């Protein structure tokens, strides 16, 4: 009817127009935003990646952009802004073809055929570095650090990343290594110098007082039980109606607990970690101070992350009430360390844990809350770049330079393909050339001239050279330290091809009532 024609044209207009605004990426371009919200709050933003994940929209076509960034982070952890901008290119293709009289189902098909050919050509130009070899990993990690904010804490960070991923690794080029095994914890105190890689499992938690086990031998505690004591879960016949009577009930309650924590220690506990959700109050607030005395660690109202990691890696299973004695299904352990460092920080390290041959943890340290943040982003990207090699190896051009390069090789393959699909893909080759162009355009004034020029300089270099996108100048782009993993650009194409395709597929208005 008229419902399918008008929806496709507007939804494509509406994502694409926002994608035009958004395309100011790489380097210093556009003008800052101080943002008066639709709820009246002052918000300040910088960085393309951080914005896209945060972005709060209600236009169904634009929501695709938000979530596209998140999938990219999970597979690559690189190219999070990149994947959105190139998706906006595919949208640019879709309008011009509707006018030509190529039907929407056909334009979907062509995206697959664009993907299949494109990624194969990415693998062709790529120089295949080894994913278990440290030297090439070390160069690649520098590339990602030096493109982020750091340029002097980069020195410390490159080698820690090659070591961290080495612990989790699996020899193959198949999909392995994750940030479900790479555990990332923050700690106030230490410095970027003192950041520590523990090959086992270390959990981030807060431990009461300072004066507790920092030595070897531990039985790691995963409990799901509340105490039995007077006015807890055991009978008392003393009913209070006075401050004095209140005092008695609490005294006998805390007293029995001082006995109880000895049976907890008999086990070998030097670590106990309490469940997230109570069954009354859990171990009482009195119990925690008594436990501290036995030399046994605490955390009530534990985060979600810890519960998942403990059970998986160390094989740690729930245990019976203490009056009934612990069931002993707890895993192996040998370290209960409360990490203090430059006067601050509370942490649990578990060393001599059982493992499935995975799971590393990096501790992220900084003497000030902003200084931790500065280590944290930079390391995240450096871990992830080496990661991408195990999942699928090799190095291609970085900054999104092979999507510009890919355009030349790809036009040729469309013409000789000589399908219905050829025209859709050829038109996408020309759209991938707009990405350094569009980026610059919005910032200033005088748009047209520079825009045409950047496409000439990259194209003419041929199938092996063009303009760099992290230094400028026509020079070899395939190895020169302007590289990124094969995984980053193939992943980006893949994700884009799926999300965009979906806009074409709908017909007629739809709105659940």
């Amino acid at each position: 009817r008229d419902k399918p024609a008008q929806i496709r044209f507007s939804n494509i207009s509406a994502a694409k127009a926002v994608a035009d605004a958004i395309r100011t990426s790489l380097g210093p371009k556009g003008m800052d935003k101080m943002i008066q919200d639709g709820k009246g709050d002052v918000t300040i933003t910088n960085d393309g990646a951080t914005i896209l994940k945060q972005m709060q929209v209600l236009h169904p076509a634009a929501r695709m952009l938000v979530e596209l960034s998140k999938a990219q982070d999970i597979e690559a952890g690189d190219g999070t802004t990149s994947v959105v901008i190139i998706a906006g290119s595919l949208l640019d293709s879709c309008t011009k073809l509707l006018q030509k009289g190529i039907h929407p189902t056909i334009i979907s098909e062509s995206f697959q055929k664009a993907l299949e050919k494109g990624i194969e050509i990415l693998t062709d130009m790529s120089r295949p570095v080894e994913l278990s070899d440290r030297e090439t990993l070390l160069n690649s990690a520098t590339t990602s650090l030096n493109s982020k904010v750091v340029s002097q804490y980069s020195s410390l960070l490159s080698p820690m990343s090659v070591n961290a991923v080495m612990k989790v690794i699996d020899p193959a080029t198949a999909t392995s290594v994750d940030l479900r095994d790479i555990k990332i914890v923050k700690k106030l105190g230490g410095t970027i110098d003192d950041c520590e890689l523990v090959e086992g499992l270390v959990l981030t938690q807060k431990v009461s007082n300072s004066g507790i086990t920092r030595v070897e031998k531990a039985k790691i505690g995963l409990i799901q039980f509340c105490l039995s004591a007077p006015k807890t879960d055991m009978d008392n016949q003393i009913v209070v109606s006075d401050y004095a009577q209140m005092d008695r009930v609490l005294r006998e309650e805390r007293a029995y607990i001082l006995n109880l924590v000895k049976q907890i220690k008999k086990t070998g506990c030097n670590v106990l970690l309490i469940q997230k959700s109570i069954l009354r109050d859990a171990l009482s607030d009195l119990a925690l101070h008594f436990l501290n005395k036995m030399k046994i660690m605490v955390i009530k109202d534990i985060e979600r992350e810890d519960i998942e990691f403990i059970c998986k890696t160390i094989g740690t299973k729930p245990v019976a009430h203490i009056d009934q004695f612990t069931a002993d299904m707890l895993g192996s352990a040998e370290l209960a360390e409360e990490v203090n460092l430059n006067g601050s920080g509370k942490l649990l390290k578990i060393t001599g844990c059982a493992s499935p041959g995975k799971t590393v943890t990096i501790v992220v340290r900084g003497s000030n809350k902003l200084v931790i943040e500065e280590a944290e982003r930079s390391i995240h990207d450096a871990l992830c770049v080496i990661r991408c090699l195990v999942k699928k190896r090799a190095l291609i051009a970085g900054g999104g330079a092979p999507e510009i390069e890919l355009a030349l090789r790809l036009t040729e393959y469309s013409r000789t393909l000589s399908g219905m699909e050829s025209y859709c893909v050829r038109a996408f080759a020309d759209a991938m050339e707009v990405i350094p162009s569009t980026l610059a355009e919005n910032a200033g004034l005088n748009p047209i001239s520079t825009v045409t020029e950047l496409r000439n300089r990259h194209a003419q270099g041929e199938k092996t050279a063009g303009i760099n996108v992290r230094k400028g100048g026509i020079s070899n782009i395939l190895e020169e330290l302007v590289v990124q993993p094969l995984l980053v650009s193939v992943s980006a194409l893949t994700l884009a091809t799926e999300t965009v395709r979906s806009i074409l597929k709908i017909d007629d208005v739809v709105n659940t009532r």
Binding site: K96, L408, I448
Partner: protein, 517 residues
């Protein structure tokens, strides 16, 4: 004041060209859909061809005005492909607009179009032959005859109209150089028969004057006495009455007419010739007497009409009755009188085998509509064979040549890059508009049919395999039997490119509001 400046002015231009283009697009090939022009008196006409439709059309914009001139040059040499230059010129701009939006100037692309034209012609030359002789070009001319007839007046081949059409052009070619014009050959139409009644005239045809259908009709000799002087007393294109003032002078005036019939009849006889062409006339009675005396006159011949016979014969017309010698008369190879119409009076054919500089192919028609279409086919026929005589080449055209070139120009965008890259991309898709819009007008999807031929461009080159142009299930161009001259298609490529070069020239987008008046 008002001002469309730079970019704005350029957008305006694009809107004019694509509307002109599209009317032409749905008129491409014999799968074409006809044009109806309605005038300012509401008189309806059905025509075809780019050149004619524009000329009638009141120009509404700047690119429209440019195209009329362009078309008329295509019409004169080639006589086909008049609508197809226009489609290509507007098309190429419709893409230039898309390049414009990306952020390429119209300046950059417009230089690389000239280069992209140069590479397209180069590719063309490889396609089909470039050597024929004039007793073997005839099989392509038969292929040209199928399509040209069968989209205009009839939907069929007519072998009679075609074969008459091709001879006429050859008679003039062998007189000078192996070159003919478009002023040495003409299609003159006069209504009386049917479209299949036709003649080959080797010189010209004039209406032969006869007073009555009881007077004698003879012809003799092989030679024409071209005169302006009398062959029987004048009455020189004005009213006359009789201004006698006695009975006596009336009786006197008749015997004086008798002697002058005899004396002119003998003076012409003696020099040689006995059919006279005289520019002047004389009343109905005097003429009737001369026809009875025998040796037929032609009386009441136009002032242009005498000039026409003279140029074709190569000789001269006497200014006087005194001065007559055989030299001073024009030279014919035969004079024979043929029945004009099919229930109308006889005409005079003056064929020439002496000299030829005007060879008319005489076409008869019923109505005014059916004659005008039929002559439209003839004009286009005269022109395609004009290309062959001068240098003998043909190309397979209709879709075959264009697509093959298109793929070629596409490929070089990626060999070269630099300035011309964008220009090459746009030029390669423009060429592909031509088979495409032909399928748009025709029964079958434009995308699907374009895709079909493109497959066979990778599998094999220099194809006799284009799209359908007889509205068939199969697709060839050997079995759809459309052939163009190689030069003819070549001339299109030049012209389309041309239009772009003209709009680029100055920077005077300044108007006082005078820019299309």
């Amino acid at each position: 004041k008002s001002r469309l400046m730079g970019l704005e002015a350029l957008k305006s231009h694009i809107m004019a060209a694509k509307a002109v283009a599209n009317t032409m697009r749905t008129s491409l090939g014999p799968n074409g859909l006809d044009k109806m022009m309605v005038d300012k008196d509401g008189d309806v006409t059905v025509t075809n061809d780019g050149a004619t439709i524009l000329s009638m059309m009141d120009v509404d914009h700047q690119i429209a005005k440019l195209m009329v001139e362009l078309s008329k040059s295509q019409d004169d040499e080639i006589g086909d492909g008049t609508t197809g230059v226009v489609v290509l010129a507007g098309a190429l701009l419709e893409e230039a607009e898309q390049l414009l939006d990306r952020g390429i100037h119209p300046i950059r692309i417009a230089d690389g179009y000239e280069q992209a034209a140069r590479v397209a012609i180069e590719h063309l030359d490889k396609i089909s032959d470039s050597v024929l002789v004039d007793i073997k070009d005839t099989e392509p001319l038969i292929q040209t005859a199928k399509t040209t007839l069968g989209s205009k007046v009839v939907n069929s081949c007519h072998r009679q109209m075609a074969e008459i059409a091709v001879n006429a052009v050859l008679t003039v070619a062998d007189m000078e150089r192996r070159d003919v014009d478009f002023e040495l050959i003409k299609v003159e139409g006069k209504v009386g028969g049917r479209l299949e009644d036709t003649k080959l005239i080797k010189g010209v045809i004039v209406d032969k004057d006869f007073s009555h259908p009881q007077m004698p009709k003879k012809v003799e000799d092989a030679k024409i006495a071209i005169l302006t002087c009398p062959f029987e007393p004048p009455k020189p294109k004005t009213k006359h009455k009789l201004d006698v003032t006695s009975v006596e002078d009336y009786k006197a005036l008749q015997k004086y007419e008798k002697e002058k019939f005899e004396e002119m009849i003998q003076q012409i006889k003696e020099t040689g010739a006995n059919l006279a062409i005289c520019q002047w006339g004389f009343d109905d009675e005097a003429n009737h007497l001369l026809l009875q005396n025998n040796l037929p006159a032609v009386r009441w011949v136009g002032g242009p009409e005498i000039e026409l016979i003279a140029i074709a014969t190569g000789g001269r017309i006497v200014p006087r009755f005194s001065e007559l010698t055989a030299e001073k008369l024009g030279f014919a190879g035969l004079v024979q009188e043929i029945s004009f119409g099919t229930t109308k009076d006889k005409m005079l054919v003056i064929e020439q085998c002496k000299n030829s500089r005007a060879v008319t192919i005489f076409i008869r028609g019923g109505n005014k509509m059916i004659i005008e279409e039929a002559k439209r086919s003839l004009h286009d026929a005269l022109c395609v064979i004009r290309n062959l005589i001068r240098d003998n080449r043909v190309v397979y055209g209709g879709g075959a040549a264009e697509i093959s070139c298109a793929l070629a120009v596409s490929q070089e965008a990626d060999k070269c890059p630099t300035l011309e890259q964008y220009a090459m991309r746009a030029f390669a898709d423009a060429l592909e508009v031509i088979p495409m819009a032909l399928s748009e007008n025709s029964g079958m999807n434009p995308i699907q049919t374009m895709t079909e031929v493109r497959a066979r461009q990778v599998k094999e080159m220099n194809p006799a395999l284009g799209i359908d142009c007889l509205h068939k299930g199969t697709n060839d161009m050997k079995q759809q039997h459309v052939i163009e001259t190689l030069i003819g298609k070549k001339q299109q490529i030049s012209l389309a490119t041309q239009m772009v070069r003209m709009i680029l020239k100055i920077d005077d987008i300044r108007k006082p509001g005078e820019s299309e008046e």
